[PDB]
Design a protein around this ligand. Structure first.
Ligand SMILES: [Zn+2]
Ligand SMILES: [Zn+2]
Ligand SMILES: [Zn+2]
Ligand SMILES: [Zn+2]
Lengths: 639, 634
């Protein structure tokens, strides 16, 4: 059994050939839209400080001016080609966009004295690159203001690389963000940080080679930035009312809060002076995720449809061009009004259809199996295809939002862990060889979906079974070859690769500077996650923390291996009281500055039992950024 | 193969016998607490208008003064006994509680002129009964004010039976509720209404007989009310700030918002004049659900722990007795301070431990499998046992909240529907007979957990396989006999019963009057759910609605079988414009008043294509309250 990337099976090739026949030949419409306003193309590379590649559009040349290969869904191939169109774009005079230099776009508005930006891209490196491409064709001006459209890393991530933290803290640079920005940005990207960043590798397929038999696109972007720096700079002005009008450097900004739709902290930006609506990631030219593969809170499709309709009503009649923080604009009022109506209907359908079927007694997987397509004319639009969000996943996500993972059947009340279930199922099926025979029967039949279910049990029962791994990877690859969903392709390709070759050595948060924006409260919330309860039991203690810089008191309590904190108060009977600054704390937990060294230097001043502070830091776990996904967890010692 | 309730197997009996040996003998402490302040006991029956039984404490006599049977977990049996203590209770002079006459409790505060209530129970029938028991021991006075502690049916459900809708709309009666009350009450109880009410029958085990081999308790209550009326009356004062002080009829009410913890719209009520904290359902004497079996939005354990700590700081030093909207109070500042600290730690552990393991790469079921108990002293408290919320479920729920149902493994990206998976698994295992052989092996071994997994595939592959159904029910019954979790027992017992005898004829929302509180916006949100997309495709239309009573305009749009609405606006080119009142609309959709009849009467006035309005109503589905859970649909 081979570990090599197999060609498309006859079944796969035939399946893709049939997709070619049934695609809307409306063609060039989105190509003309993606090309319109192109000032300077980009096909090059973005490198980091150490000369490592961060971004590379050149890797995708195989897509340009060529027809779809048998190993890639033709509809997916079309989207991939559109996403190859990168560079600096002029929407209108004074209104620019840098697209395809990062997963997200950067909107640049030319003000009276400087520049007003909508989003800062994913990394410092890509943010800098995007701004440099802009400065190659437009005069050098300072950044006067920044808008964070939502709490997603691809929008706030590159902030520090282009703006100064001190200028934001001073109010010199206005940084706008929707209600609940930090809370949600830190929960998603920091608190559940390690899990998300790793799961995200499957979503983007970053470590998978670029080619017709591997990584081709990610639906709303190509892939993610490698070997780069994620940053976080807290906003200065928060959008709290449903609508807020603010003018900065002679630029009229009209914010529409869209909380709990695409992101927990989210908003649209209307530009009155331009007759342009920036729909952030609320209406991209593909079905978005109600539940993201990387892992984040469920999204509300009802609210999402409501917010879209609100934009269509409030701005639809005064918008000449719709711009987004992913992909190309939509030109002309007529087209924008149709687009928004179509977008709204898609989210409303996802919600209402699932609730209709839920109330009929259908469970998550029954619902996903019964709704095969978008209704009426929605199935005929290019901008509504499941390139990013999957119809099945989104239907399952509505079920999750309203009811949860549990289907109501008590036989599913207490599922076994994958290894325990794997061993039992393999035995029940006649042992390893019997499952391998059935896997081969399924692959021959072209039932790749069943073969992956079969193989997963075997791989989890015995990760040392090489035939099981090769067959599992072969079936996933064929599934990836067939899928129109870019994210599903990426997940399947990553899975295939990791089954065959193991997990590649890469950490998305390696160079991450997001921990700087963290308040002491946020910081202790992370320590509460890091704390090893098993080790911490029998070590009840109270630690008081006084931040001389922030004039903030935190009462930390460790009880029964559980860490809780109180902001603004101090415990009178605290085992220890720690006097320091936020920077000093950062260094100690990041293992940059040693504890007795800080006491020696006088940066840390203790009152009471200092041993207790040392033992507290000894109870904290350190999360490895690598973890097995397609096979069981790498243990550690012998079992 | 038999359809009869089997006795406990030797394995089951032995397993339960061992539980008896290892339980905290702190006994009487919770019994003294549950009995304290009992004015008048209740063991009787509550009946509806038609003389049908609604509530019956008498059905649980088997628990009283008897030791746990073979067929019931002893820790569960203890809880069941405590939950049998029902009636009228005095916490303090002017402060009363009616407990065990409904799933929830009713708090009665005696004001200057009348009564100030905290919650109205689940149904009109139980609310009335509870208030009558109170009036048998205390003077007759009017209800001056009502507090809805949260958006749960067991708290707002009996409102109409004890208060007047007109008095609330007029401001004569003050009705307090936390921020987002109606939105969340309607979403949970109405929009996902049918699914929730039906799933709830498994959670409560309402249709399962009461006995040592069947329904015994529901952890925070006995079960739910049968053949009764759920009501909904909209509040008139909404608590929007984190803390709000309001005084009504000389009663000082201090509200603490606890949004997104136990319920999306939720709050605690501090009573300054009494030195009493009402923790609603935020700190009951059992682990609560982060994910409810009946189906609702995930709960935030982080926020939940944060809110508890905030109560402990803000009121802990000024509280003599803690009262709750389920179960008995906790007496004395020292005990209340320990309780709240314990409660907070439980929720914080659930969140933090799961996040710790999530970041270690553990998936939902691996996390549930690795954490077997609460840490340190938390495992030693009676009030922290998994009688209601399950530790496994709650850990799985934290994973759900942060990451979702999908574990990140692409082999689980597109699971087959139960029938398709059932057929494939059964075939893969050597066909029906081979699975039955393996099921029998599992049951003999006492591996009931594996037998239910095996049998589910078979029952879904062929629901006509009688041996598969009987064996599946037998295994679930044994699982029910073993469990400390009351909710899990109820679910297993309901499953067993329905596998053996099919779905009983009962609807929890049969007599429901909740649709009255619905705004036209809310009403059209329900119609959007009811709309049959398949039938509606090719019937694009625009319908304008003008409510003469409310002075509200609604623009309805049906496009590609998708129903959307705009509040406060009208479409100029609408296919039809409907002029009516909210009451008139209610009757048409409830099929009480016919369309041409309303036009004849002049209650419905049309402008444009009236045929289109008739075809619109023809596109609406009607949800049957009955649906198969433990076998394939119908
Ligand atoms: Zn986004
Ligand atoms: Zn984005
Ligand atoms: Zn309740
Ligand atoms: Zn509740």
């Amino acid at each position: 059994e081979s570990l090599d990337s197999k060609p498309a099976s006859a079944i796969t090739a035939a399946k893709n050939a049939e997709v070619l026949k049934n695609l809307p030949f409306a063609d060039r419409e989105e190509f003309e839209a993606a090309k319109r306003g192109l000032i300077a193309p980009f096909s090059g590379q973005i490198k980091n400080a150490e000369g490592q590649v961060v971004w590379d559009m050149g890797a995708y040349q195989f897509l340009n001016d060529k027809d779809a290969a048998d190993t890639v869904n033709p509809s997916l191939w079309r989207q991939a080609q559109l996403n190859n169109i990168a560079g600096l774009f002029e929407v209108m005079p004074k209104l620019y966009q840098v697209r395809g230099l990062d997963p997200a776009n950067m909107t640049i508005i030319e003000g009276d004295s400087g520049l007003v930006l909508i989003d800062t891209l994913t990394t410092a490196e890509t943010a800098r690159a995007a701004l440099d491409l802009y400065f190659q064709h437009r005069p050098k001006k300072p950044i006067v203001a920044v808008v964070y459209s939502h709490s997603h890393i691809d929008h706030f991530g590159g902030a520090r690389g282009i703006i100064d933290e001190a200028d934001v803290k001073a109010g010199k640079v206005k940084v706008f963000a929707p209600s609940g920005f930090m809370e949600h940005a830190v929960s998603e990207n920091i608190l559940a940080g390690t899990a998300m960043a790793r799961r995200g590798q499957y979503q983007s397929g970053v470590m998978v080679p670029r080619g017709a038999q591997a990584q081709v696109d990610s639906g709303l972007f190509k892939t993610t930035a490698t070997n780069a720096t994620n940053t976080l700079v807290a906003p200065n002005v928060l959008i709290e009312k449903p609508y807020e009008r603010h003018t900065v450097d002679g630029v009229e900004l009209e914010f529409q809060l869209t909380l709990g739709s695409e992101a927990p902290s989210d908003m649209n930006i209307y530009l009155p002076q331009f007759k342009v609506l920036n729909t952030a990631d609320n209406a991209p030219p593909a079905m978005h995720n109600l539940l993201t593969p990387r892992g984040a809170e469920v999204r509300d499709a009802k609210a999402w449809a409501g917010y879209i309709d609100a934009s269509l009503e409030k701005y639809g009649d005064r918008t000449d061009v719709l711009i987004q923080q992913h992909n190309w604009p939509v030109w002309g009022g007529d087209k924008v009004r149709t687009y928004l109506a179509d977008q709204r209907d898609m989210y409303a359908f996802l919600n209402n259809r699932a609730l209709n079927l839920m109330n009929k007694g259908l469970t998550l997987h029954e619902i996903a199996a019964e709704v095969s397509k978008l209704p009426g004319e929605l199935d005929r639009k290019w901008y509504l295809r499941s390139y990013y969000g999957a119809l099945s996943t989104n239907l399952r996500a509505v079920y999750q939002r309203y009811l949860g993972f549990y289907d109501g059947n008590p036989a599913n009340l207490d599922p076994f862990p994958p290894v325990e279930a794997g061993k039992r199922y393999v035995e029940a099926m006649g042992g390893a060889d019997a499952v391998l025979k059935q896997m081969r029967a399924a692959i021959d039949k072209g039932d790749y979906r069943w073969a992956v279910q079969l193989g997963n049990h075997l791989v989890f029962a015995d990760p040392a079974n090489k035939d099981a791994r090769a067959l599992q990877a072969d079936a996933m690859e064929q599934l990836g070859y067939q899928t129109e969903n870019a994210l599903w392709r990426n997940m399947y390709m990553t899975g295939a690769m990791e089954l065959r070759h193991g997990v590649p050595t890469y950490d998305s948060r390696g160079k991450s500077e997001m921990g700087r924006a963290l308040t002491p409260d946020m910081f202790f919330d992370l320590l509460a996650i890091r704390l090893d309860t098993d080790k911490a039991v029998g070590h009840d203690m109270t630690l008081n923390w006084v931040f001389e810089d922030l004039k903030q008191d935190i009462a930390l309590t460790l009880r029964n291996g559980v860490l809780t904190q109180r902001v603004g108060s101090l415990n009178p009977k605290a085992d220890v009281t720690v006097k320091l600054t936020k920077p000093t704390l950062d260094q100690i937990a990041a293992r940059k500055l040693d504890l007795p060294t800080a006491i020696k230097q006088g940066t840390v001043k203790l009152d009471g039992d200092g041993k207790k502070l040392g033992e507290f830091f000894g109870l904290l776990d350190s999360f490895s950024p690598k973890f097995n996904i397609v096979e069981l967890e790498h243990h550690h010692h012998h079992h």
